[PDB]
Structures are given as structure tokens and as C-alpha cells.
Amino acid sequence: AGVKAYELRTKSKEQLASQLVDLKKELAELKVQKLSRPSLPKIKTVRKSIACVLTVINEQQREAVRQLYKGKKYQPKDLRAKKTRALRRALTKFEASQVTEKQRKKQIAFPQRKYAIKA
Amino acid sequence: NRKRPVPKGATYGKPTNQGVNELKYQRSLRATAEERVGRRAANLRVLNSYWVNQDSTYKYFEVILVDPQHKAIRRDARYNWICDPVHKHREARGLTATGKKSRGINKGHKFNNTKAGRRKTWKRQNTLSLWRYRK
Amino acid sequence: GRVIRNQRKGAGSIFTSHTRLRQGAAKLRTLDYAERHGYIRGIVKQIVHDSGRGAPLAKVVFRDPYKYRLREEIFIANEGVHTGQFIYAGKKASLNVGN
Amino acid sequence: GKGTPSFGKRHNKSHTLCNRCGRRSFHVQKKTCSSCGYPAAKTRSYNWGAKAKRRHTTGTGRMRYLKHVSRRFKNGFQTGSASKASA
Amino acid sequence: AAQKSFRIKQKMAKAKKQNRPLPQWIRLRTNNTIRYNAKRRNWRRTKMNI
Amino acid sequence: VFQVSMKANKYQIKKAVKELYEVDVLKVNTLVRPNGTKKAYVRLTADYDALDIANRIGYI
Amino acid sequence: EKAGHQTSAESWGTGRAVARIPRVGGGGTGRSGQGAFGNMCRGGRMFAPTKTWRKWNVKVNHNEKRYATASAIAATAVASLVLARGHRVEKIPEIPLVVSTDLESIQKTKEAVAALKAVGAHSDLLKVLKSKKLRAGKGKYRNRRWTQRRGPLVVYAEDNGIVKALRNVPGVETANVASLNLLQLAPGAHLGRFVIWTEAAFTKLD
RNA sequence: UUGACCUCAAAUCAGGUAGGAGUACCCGCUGAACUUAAGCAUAUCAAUAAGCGGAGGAAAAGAAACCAACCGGGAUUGCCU
RNA sequence: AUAUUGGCGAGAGACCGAUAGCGAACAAGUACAGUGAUGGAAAGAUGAAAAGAACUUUGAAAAGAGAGUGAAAAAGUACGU
RNA sequence: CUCGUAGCGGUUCUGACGUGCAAAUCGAUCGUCGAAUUUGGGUAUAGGGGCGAAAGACUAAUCGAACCAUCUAGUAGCUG
RNA sequence: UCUUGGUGGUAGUAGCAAAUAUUCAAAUGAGAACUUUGAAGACUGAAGUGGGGAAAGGUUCCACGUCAACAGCAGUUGGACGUGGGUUAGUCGAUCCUAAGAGAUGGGGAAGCUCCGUUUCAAAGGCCUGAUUUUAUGCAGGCCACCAUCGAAAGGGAAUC
RNA sequence: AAACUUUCAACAACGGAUCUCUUGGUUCUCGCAUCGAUGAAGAACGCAGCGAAAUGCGAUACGUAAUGUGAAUUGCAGAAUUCCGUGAAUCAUCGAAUCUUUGAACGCACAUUGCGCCCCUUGGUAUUCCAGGGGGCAUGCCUGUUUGAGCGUCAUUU
Lengths: 119, 135, 99, 87, 50, 60, 206
Ligand SMILES: [Mg+2]
Ligand SMILES: [Mg+2]
Ligand SMILES: [Mg+2]
Ligand SMILES: [Mg+2]
Ligand SMILES: [Mg+2]
Ligand SMILES: [Mg+2]
Ligand SMILES: [Mg+2]
Ligand SMILES: [Mg+2]
Ligand SMILES: [Mg+2]
Ligand SMILES: [Mg+2]
Ligand SMILES: [Mg+2]
Ligand SMILES: [Mg+2]
Ligand SMILES: [Mg+2]
Ligand SMILES: [Mg+2]
Ligand SMILES: [Mg+2]
Ligand SMILES: [Mg+2]
Ligand SMILES: [Mg+2]
Ligand SMILES: [Mg+2]
Ligand SMILES: [Mg+2]
Ligand SMILES: [Mg+2]
Ligand SMILES: [Mg+2]
Ligand SMILES: [Mg+2]
Ligand SMILES: [Mg+2]
Ligand SMILES: [Mg+2]
Ligand SMILES: [Mg+2]
Ligand SMILES: [Mg+2]
Ligand SMILES: [Mg+2]
Ligand SMILES: [Mg+2]
Ligand SMILES: [Mg+2]
Ligand SMILES: [Mg+2]
Ligand SMILES: [Mg+2]
Ligand SMILES: [Mg+2]
Ligand SMILES: [Mg+2]
Ligand SMILES: [Mg+2]
Ligand SMILES: [Mg+2]
Ligand SMILES: [Mg+2]
Ligand SMILES: [Mg+2]
Ligand SMILES: [Mg+2]
Ligand SMILES: [Mg+2]
Ligand SMILES: [Mg+2]
Ligand SMILES: [Mg+2]
Ligand SMILES: [Mg+2]
Ligand SMILES: [Mg+2]
Ligand SMILES: [Mg+2]
Ligand SMILES: [Mg+2]
Ligand SMILES: [Mg+2]
Ligand SMILES: [Mg+2]
Ligand SMILES: [Mg+2]
Ligand SMILES: [Mg+2]
Ligand SMILES: [Mg+2]
Ligand SMILES: [Mg+2]
Ligand SMILES: [Mg+2]
Ligand SMILES: [Mg+2]
Ligand SMILES: [Mg+2]
Ligand SMILES: [Mg+2]
Ligand SMILES: [Mg+2]
Ligand SMILES: [Mg+2]
Ligand SMILES: [Mg+2]
Ligand SMILES: [Mg+2]
Ligand SMILES: [Mg+2]
Ligand SMILES: [Mg+2]
Ligand SMILES: [Mg+2]
Ligand SMILES: [Mg+2]
Ligand SMILES: [Mg+2]
Ligand SMILES: [Mg+2]
Ligand SMILES: [Mg+2]
Ligand SMILES: [Mg+2]
Ligand SMILES: [Mg+2]
Ligand SMILES: [Mg+2]
Ligand SMILES: [Mg+2]
Ligand SMILES: [Mg+2]
What we know:
The structure is cut from a larger assembly and holds seven protein chains of seven kinds.
Chain A (H helix, E strand, L loop, with lengths): L4 H4 L4 H21 L8 H25 L18 H5 L3 H4 L4 H9 L10
Helix pairs in contact in A: 2-3
Chain C lengths: L4 H4 L25 H4 L1 E10 L8 E7 L6 E7 L9 E5 L9
Antiparallel strand pairs in C: 1-2, 1-4, 2-3
Chain E lengths: L5 H12 L33
The complex binds magnesium ion (MG) (71 copies).
Chain D binds five RNA strands through strand 1, strand 2, helix 1 and helix 2.
């Protein structure tokens, strides 16, 4: 059937690392039996179990780094957002809305009034 | 003058198109200056240029360039227009002052070919515009 | 209407000098303080043959004035110059063949 | 002897495989690819070669990364994860 | 050429593993139109051009 | 006789065979097969017996 | 625009014992040596390729448009042309068939077809939905799968539900008096559509 | 001795940024010939195709060194004329 | 406001209907040709469902002749007409 | 230098063949055979250009101007 | 002398005649001029029709099964078809070196694609310290003047019979 | 009189026309703006219990995570307590990852699976040799840091 990921989030780093080793033994041992048998579909289950454990280990490791660079400048570049190269060249929301104080005075003095041609 | 390369200086067109030596290069020497500086400094945007010297062989220009990634330009609202991507390499697209001069972009009856580009105008005035109910 | 052989020689493709076997550039010793105010003594060690040249080359060996090492200049050999001959280059030198 | 017995002496190679396009167009003496123009930075394309632009343009291969941009655009370039657990 | 590059042997290795007929169970699949391997190559009939 | 990664040299074959199968290797001869796979002839030292170890892996 | 031209063919000329049409160059594909570019050649361009700048929409004088609309409304009077154009209206009491303005505020399709049958448009209604036939050519797979007849046109002055209540009914078309489509009044350029007028519609026609 | 200044360097220094793609449309540069003129050199094709450089969702242009000569209009763009 | 034979998402048609329509309805820029730039195809349709012909017999076999299946085998994978 | 093999060429039969074995071969007869020889690999020269002990020869069966794509459905008082 | 596809007559015709040459028996098989074995006759005749290799090919090598198509007759055979097996290096090559040459950098030209140049008009740099307790061996002396890189499976080259 | 040749018909051939179909093309319209040094487009090689392609993916390899749906996939085979469930599935969606060798491609090179150098670390008695694991080392330019050069140059010094 295979390992379930929600179980593997609950284990620690040393529990998951040893589980990967035992899974790699089971893949190796089944790869031997596949040379005698004509069809061994259990390869697929152990192989996706390895991919599941290796995934959960990496999500534990990347979340440790996110707590390491938590709320400072200069995250690592793969922990930065991957919008679009143009979308991160991109004058930010603060910088695009910058207004010189000569323009800030005019915008406060004479904003667009709300009005209607009725009366 | 621009020397037309055309190896051994040879035509192979009409004799109207037979000149090699006397071709004059529609963009100015100030434009070549900014284009060559903008290639060396592609992290910057060329803003303007100005003559500083000349001799028998060279004209000398000083080119003003602006860093669109420095935060003293990305803030300070008087200058962060240069940080928008429409202004990537203005000097190659001819959007500098010497580019707009040599493109002919000026108001008036003297610039009827070149007001919104001579090529755009030529496309407009050579288009057969047909309507649904033919006029 | 085709480019002639005398024009094609300037492109220098198959018309270059066959210069593999040549012994070097046959030049004089570079003009320095030794050859401008006194002299310097050389020694012929070989009268060799230069490929493509009808004149023999004399390999004349001098001492470097400023560093302890030997500098081998390549001369065109003068008729009468032999191996083992001391050769004098400079201003104060004596008139002998090969000086 | 210009036809058939001259065809016997064809056992050399002018081009081998290009590293950039894998095409047997890398001229081994000129050190250049005849189709993609490697090692030059720009990729060899010509507007008189409209069929030749068609053979190698965007869409002809896998598009490992552009085949996902439209979905990421449509969702507004989300960051994070979906909320709930199950049905 | 008995002293190959690895890049030649790697493409030579790929061509041998492609040098098989169609698997017979593929012709039994639902809505299947594949009758045969249309990309079959022989050393005798078509040179594969490096 | 093993099938190994194409990226594995004769040191990484010898190191892996030693700590997976608790043997000692006398020699490794390696060839890349005409299907593009790498085949390792791993000969053990005389203290071990490759017939017993073949049953201990599971094949024959 | 590039149909029949995505081919680099040139003529072999004379001397080759075959006609001088451009033949495809190359070798080893079957296409090689085949004639190209002609209207008579397989794969070639057609003669005089059709353009989008052919005249599609045609201009009619506004008064000649209105001339035809007035003569079409006049033809939806006395019943000879209404019988002639189909339109089972023998058992109608009188033409023009004017019904009350209360039809304009019927909002249910059940109540709408009750009213049209009660004023005698039942046989015209059953003439449609017994004439549903499959189209007789390639147009049935150009989203034109089914053909049927035209039914009674219902003309109103105010929409207060009659358009939506008569929307699903096969063959029954609706119209404001302010518009009065000629494609509805004389379908097929055949004068005499069966028209049911509401009373507000009929007064407004002055 | 020492401390600046100016100019110029170096670093696997701290942070960044440029290249390539695509290119229908857009801004430039460069630039033909077939063709027509019942020949053809001006001309025309054509300030076009091909070639090169640079952008964006539009671009460019744009708030007058304008049009006018009227009782004057009023940035730019595009449609009808 | 304007352009948009590219991309993404739609909705249409008095368009074409497998020698047509894109070169390509199909593992198509594929198979293949060329040193290379480049060139460049052919090729859709059993049946409502494989029900794709068990079994017998003749033959070394392919297969035939029966038998069957099927509405139809004047639909037998060489398959609508 | 010579006779003459291997080799490298190609005189004559105007031989065979001439829908060939072959889009240049086959056979006999021949030139020359220690150098201005013959030859593999590497390398350089690219189209109005190269290269040419020079024949407008050769430059992938293409040469008094290669090949590929585009302009281009180039134009035709001419033939179907 | 249209285009694409299909089909005829010619016509069971022309032809399948270079490289001296085949023959007997048995075996296998449905079937043997052609397969296998034995016997015999012959030939290439060491500048070979013999043993290896270079380029090129790419699995054609080898085994088993098989004969619809292919081997211009045949076919039980096969370089065909189906399924597999097979290529082991410190010493053989590549890798390294330079050759003719190719080619970056500094720099100059060119509107530009890019061109020139390979030591130039550049501030172009690593090498050992004698030998170790304040040494991640330098925070030191001291030395060196050249200046990328690619280029040979026939040249140069560490070592296996 | 046959045979032969010719004509027509039937049945059988050859061939794939005709008719009918159509997950394709073509043209028009409407809406949107989103590639890449955070490594794109393109390429190569590989990956499935049995796949040569197309499609998908990258040694976590016709996929992992997550979320939604709610019991399949299937040509076989296998599994199907999991099936009133954190739950089938070649499902949909997709925000988390992985993403070989490349490629603008970036230590040097590339007709090579060729060769360096640095840091951390492991083993072989090892700072130096050999190997394994991890992480690096391109160019231009900008800002800043630090270390510097120049009798360019200013003060200041027994
Ligand atoms: Mg001139
Ligand atoms: Mg209109
Ligand atoms: Mg020739
Ligand atoms: Mg010939
Ligand atoms: Mg090629
Ligand atoms: Mg491009
Ligand atoms: Mg390789
Ligand atoms: Mg090997
Ligand atoms: Mg080996
Ligand atoms: Mg067509
Ligand atoms: Mg019809
Ligand atoms: Mg840094
Ligand atoms: Mg434009
Ligand atoms: Mg423009
Ligand atoms: Mg005209
Ligand atoms: Mg004319
Ligand atoms: Mg004239
Ligand atoms: Mg003329
Ligand atoms: Mg003009
Ligand atoms: Mg153009
Ligand atoms: Mg964009
Ligand atoms: Mg807009
Ligand atoms: Mg703008
Ligand atoms: Mg003003
Ligand atoms: Mg105005
Ligand atoms: Mg489009
Ligand atoms: Mg048909
Ligand atoms: Mg077609
Ligand atoms: Mg080829
Ligand atoms: Mg059919
Ligand atoms: Mg059914
Ligand atoms: Mg039967
Ligand atoms: Mg029937
Ligand atoms: Mg039957
Ligand atoms: Mg029938
Ligand atoms: Mg039938
Ligand atoms: Mg002689
Ligand atoms: Mg003689
Ligand atoms: Mg001889
Ligand atoms: Mg002759
Ligand atoms: Mg003759
Ligand atoms: Mg023949
Ligand atoms: Mg002699
Ligand atoms: Mg020889
Ligand atoms: Mg010339
Ligand atoms: Mg002559
Ligand atoms: Mg040509
Ligand atoms: Mg023509
Ligand atoms: Mg024909
Ligand atoms: Mg015939
Ligand atoms: Mg005969
Ligand atoms: Mg005979
Ligand atoms: Mg003999
Ligand atoms: Mg003999
Ligand atoms: Mg056998
Ligand atoms: Mg035969
Ligand atoms: Mg046979
Ligand atoms: Mg064999
Ligand atoms: Mg086989
Ligand atoms: Mg050796
Ligand atoms: Mg080197
Ligand atoms: Mg080397
Ligand atoms: Mg030597
Ligand atoms: Mg048939
Ligand atoms: Mg027909
Ligand atoms: Mg349309
Ligand atoms: Mg998997
Ligand atoms: Mg799930
Ligand atoms: Mg699933
Ligand atoms: Mg090499
Ligand atoms: Mg090296």
C-alpha cells in the first residue's frame, strides 16, 4: 500500500532517516526477486514510499530554514518567491506609490471631488 | 561618413544605389555614443548625453546613466519612472533627446512624415480600410 | 571577370612563407649600453644553414649584462667567420670581419 | 570517375553532433553548428527560414517550465498551501 | 569504429533498445489504432546518421 | 556480477559492495554494456565465497 | 494565405520529358518530384484564393428598407398570402388577428401557448414541431443540424414577460412594433407571415 | 614619520543587475532586386523583402518653438472626411 | 480611444470535408533524403457490442470446407459503401 | 637515366557493354614507375569568391559561375 | 508531353551468360541443384578468395526458435525474422604534449550580427619558506619577466608478458 | 466446330472512386498579459510489473507533496481492511518539493562523459598523497566595504 505522508510528518529527523534506509533495503531485496519472478508490482509501492519519505524530510528541512531566516532581510534565493523575473524586477508597492511632497500637497489640496449634475 | 561595407566596395544594384563613400548614417554620433555605453552598462538606463570635446577623428560625449535598482532611484518619485520596464534601452529605441531629434519627432507641418513614427504613418497611409457597408 | 593570381596573393592563404624549418629571425643584438659606449664579446658556436635562405646563419652567444645567463643571438654569417671565433659588437670595437 | 568511384572515398565527416541542438550539424573544422549556430550565444534563426523557425520554436519541445506559467498566472501567483483536510 | 566516443556509444545503445517490434498487448487496448512500429530501423536498410 | 550506476567509479563500487554485503573486494572490472548500462565484475578476496553470498543476496 | 505555398518547388523546365509545372525538389519522401503550386496540382493553391475583403454586408437605402417593411406588414393582412406562405390560418375568424394587451404580461410558457391556441394559432403551432427534419447536407455538421417551419409572429408594445414566455415555443417569434424585422415578416422573401398583434401593438402602428 | 584629498585599481568582498527566448503587433538602424515605364539609366517596385539592435500588454506619440490668418482654434492617438 | 497571421482563454461561420481543409484529422515537421543549410510525405471509417470464428475435417503448413457468432461475414482485423 | 612489376594514369581497339555489373565499368593493348612520385590523417583558402604546371578546368554525379531558403504566383507582344 | 493515385498491352517477353566446377552418398525435412556431415574433384596460390587492423558501420558478433516478407531460381539456410547472451585494462589506446593551424582576454574597429589580433601600448603572478609550537604553516623573508585554451586513436609519450 | 479475339450481363477479382460521416483545419469576433542568471526556450539520455512511439516525468523519474472529488485502473497481471474512508483513481485541481547531463550556461575545456583550484568533512598511520560526501570558483556594470597604487597632490613632522 505504502507510507502515508501525514504519518511521516509526525516523526523526527532520525526516525525518518532510518525509515528511508529500511525502505532502500526493501527496494534492493525486491529488485533481486524481480529477476526470478515474471511480474513484481510491489516495486511500485516501495518506490513511491521512498519518494514520500524523501519529500517529508525535505519539507522538514526547508521549514527549519524558514524559521531560521524568519523575518529578516536576505532569505536564500530558493526560499524567495518565484513569481516571474519581470514580476520581481518590479518597483514594489511602496516605491511605485511614492509621491514627491510637491505632488502630495496638490493631491491633498485638490483631490477629485464627488459630484452629480442634478441640482 | 558611414562607409557602406559591401565587400570590395562593390554595387550589384542599380547605379542609383552605386554610392559607397558618401553614405551618411541617419542616427547621429551622439546616438552611437549612448548605444555603445548602454551596451557596456546594461544594468543602467541612459538618461541623456552631451558633447564634451572633439578633434579630427573623434567626437567626445559624456553620457548620464541612472541605476534603476538603486534605492535612491527606486524611491524618490521624481526619478523612478526610469525603473519601469518600458524604458529598457531607450537609446536603442531612440527615445533619448538625440533619438527623438533624429527620428523627426516634432510637432508641426515640417514633420508630416515623422510625428508618430514615419513607418507607422506609412503603414496607416498605405492601408486600404474597408468597412462592412462599403463606403 | 575573375580575380587574378597577383591579387589573390595578398589574402595570404596558400601564399605564405614555409617557415617551419627556419632557425629564427636573423637580427642584430639589441642596442644597449654595452654596444653604445664600449663593446661586448660574443662567441660563434654554430654556423648553421637557414631553410629557404642562401646564406649561412652564425649562432653567436653573448653574456647578459644585467642577469647571469647567456643570450644567444642569431646572426647572418659573414664570409670568413668561423666557429669558435670571438665576435665584438659595440662602438669601441675593432675592425675585423664579423665585428 | 566523378560519379560512382568518387563516391567510394566518402568516409570522413564534416559535421558531428552539436551539443546545443543534437543535430549532426557541428562542423568539426569550423567548430560551429550549421543549424543552431553554437557556440554563439544567439540561436541561429532566419526570417527566410519560416519552416526552419517552425521546427525548433517554443512548443516543439517539452516546455518544462512555460507549460506551468499560465496556471500560476491564473491563480495570481499564489504562495502557500490550500486550507482544509478532506471531504 | 571500435574506438568510439561515449556520446556515440550512448546513442548506439539507445538505438538497440528501440530496435524491437510493437508489444502485442498494446494492440489489444481500448480504441487502439497502432498496428506496428512505424519507427523501426535496420542497419541494413537505413543508416542512422550518427 | 552487478549492474551499477553509470556515475559510479571503481571506488564507489568497491565501497558500496563492502558495506552492503559485508565482504572485501580484491578487484573491480567494469564495462559499459551495449544497452547503456554499467556492468561490474566484482571479485571477492579468498576469505569469502561468492556462491554463499549469492544465496545470501537471494539469486540462485 | 500560405496554403499551397509552404513548399520550395521550382520547375524542372523542358528536357526532362515531363510538363513544366513546378515540381518538389529533394529525395526520399514521395513528395519529391511531385507537381506543386498550380490550381490543378494536388496540394497546390486554389485558383483565386478567397479573401476576407469580399463584400459580405450589403447596403440598402433606409427608405427602401422601410418600403419593404411597410409592404410586408400590409401583406400580413388579408389571408390569401398568409395561406400561400404556409401558415395554417383557415379556421382563424379574421386577419389581422388582434388579441388583448393582457398577452404582453403572460410570464409562463404554459399560459402562453394556451392563449395562442385559444385564438386559433394551434394548427400553425402544430405545423412546427411536426416539421423538424434533419438538414439535407454538409450544413448539419456546421451547427445547423435541424430545420423546421416558421410559426406565428407575436407583436407587442411592452415586454412584461411575453418574450420569455414565448421563447421556448418552437416557431413562435416575437417583435416590438418599434422594430418589426423584415426577416421575420417575410421569411424567405415570402410575404404574409401569420402575425398575432396585441391591442397596444396594433394601436401603436399608427 | 603621519593624517587626509584626487585619480586609478584589486578581491570567490556585501547586495544586486545584463545576456538568451519569443517576436503577430511596436521603436529604430540597414537595405535590395525581380516588376512597371510596352526598350531603359531618373523614376517605380520601395523609404518594401531580406539583415541587425531594443521593448510592452500594448508600444510609440503626447500637453505646442502647433494649426491658422478666423468672430480664430488648442496635448497625443485613431475612424469618417 | 489605436495595432495585434505570436501566447493563453473563449464564442462563432451561407467556410473545407480526407487528392479538400494547415505540410500534418492518424506516434507530423513524423517516417525518410541530404555533408549541411534545408527539404518532407503517405496514412481516417469492422461491428450496437469482439460477439475477432469454439469445435470437426482435409492439408506439412498458410489455408480450405463445414460448423458457429452476428441483423448482416454481399461487415472476417486484406474489415462501411 | 632506362627495361619492367606493385602502384599511379588513361593511348588505341573508335573492342565488350550501351533499358549496363557500372549515371564512366569491363577486357586487351598502352604511358610512367625513386621522384616536379603516389598516398592516409590533420589543417588553410568559399561563390562573382576560392583554386588553377591554364582545360573556362575543379570547387559533394551541380560550374562560361556551386548549393539552400526567401523576395516570387518575378515578367512573358510566345506555346499548350 | 496537366496534377495525384490506380491500371493495361508489350509479356510469361527481354532476360537472370564476367570472376575455370562441380559430383556421389547419407542425415534433417512436407519439400534438397543450393542445408549439414562424409567422400571426391577443383581454385585463391603468401602484393591470397589467408590472419589482423584504420575510417565508416553499429550489434551485423554468438546461441535458441523460425521461414510470411527479403537473399532478382530455390531455401530446412542466412548479415533476414522473433527471443536472448555478449565487449572486464595501473601496463593497449583516449586522456597529456606540441605541429600546420584554430582561438578567448587587454585593446582597437564596426550601426550591428560581430571583425582584427594572440603578445600585443594591460597595474595580466605563483614558487618554495631553511624547515614545524604565537602558525588554519606565514602577519616575513627569499625567488621567478613568461602571459589563455583548443589542435594527432599514424607524430612525441612511464610501465605486461 | 473449337481455341483465339471483340462486345454485353451476372458472379468473382484488382483498385479505392462515390455516398454518408468527422475529437481536424480555416476564417471572423471577444477577453486576458504571464518567459529567463530563483537558470528559460531548445537538446540529449533515462524513467512503467509487462511500452517501441505519442503523452507524462527526472535517480523522489508515465511521478512525490498538498487540496478537491468520492471507489476506481483495465490489454493482461497484481493489488484491492482502504471502500460509512485523512480515502481508490493513467481522476481533477495545484500554492509544497524534486527537477539527471545540458543549454543564454557561468571554475577551464568539450569530436573528451577530459582537467583544475578553494572550504567543510569521512576513510586510508596524512596540512601536503589517494578516495568518498557536501558547498563553491564566469564576464560586464552599479552602489557600498576593505586592501592598495601614483612626488597627481595637501597639510604635517627630531
Ligand atoms: Mg560613394
Ligand atoms: Mg460598416
Ligand atoms: Mg564534378
Ligand atoms: Mg562517375
Ligand atoms: Mg545534420
Ligand atoms: Mg531570435
Ligand atoms: Mg562523450
Ligand atoms: Mg565498457
Ligand atoms: Mg574498460
Ligand atoms: Mg491545401
Ligand atoms: Mg449530398
Ligand atoms: Mg559577492
Ligand atoms: Mg512595427
Ligand atoms: Mg518603427
Ligand atoms: Mg505601375
Ligand atoms: Mg518596362
Ligand atoms: Mg520603355
Ligand atoms: Mg529588358
Ligand atoms: Mg522610394
Ligand atoms: Mg524586416
Ligand atoms: Mg512580456
Ligand atoms: Mg489599450
Ligand atoms: Mg509610453
Ligand atoms: Mg509648456
Ligand atoms: Mg490638436
Ligand atoms: Mg495569435
Ligand atoms: Mg473519399
Ligand atoms: Mg491533406
Ligand atoms: Mg545525411
Ligand atoms: Mg475506408
Ligand atoms: Mg451496443
Ligand atoms: Mg473458413
Ligand atoms: Mg447489409
Ligand atoms: Mg464467415
Ligand atoms: Mg457488399
Ligand atoms: Mg456491408
Ligand atoms: Mg625516367
Ligand atoms: Mg621509361
Ligand atoms: Mg605498372
Ligand atoms: Mg581519352
Ligand atoms: Mg567502345
Ligand atoms: Mg540490372
Ligand atoms: Mg624506370
Ligand atoms: Mg593504395
Ligand atoms: Mg570576383
Ligand atoms: Mg576556350
Ligand atoms: Mg543552385
Ligand atoms: Mg513562375
Ligand atoms: Mg501518372
Ligand atoms: Mg506495365
Ligand atoms: Mg526467356
Ligand atoms: Mg541459357
Ligand atoms: Mg590461375
Ligand atoms: Mg592453383
Ligand atoms: Mg540458426
Ligand atoms: Mg528468391
Ligand atoms: Mg520462397
Ligand atoms: Mg552470423
Ligand atoms: Mg536478432
Ligand atoms: Mg601506454
Ligand atoms: Mg595545455
Ligand atoms: Mg590538447
Ligand atoms: Mg617526429
Ligand atoms: Mg481490395
Ligand atoms: Mg467514382
Ligand atoms: Mg468567421
Ligand atoms: Mg514512481
Ligand atoms: Mg489524495
Ligand atoms: Mg491518481
Ligand atoms: Mg581531444
Ligand atoms: Mg589539457
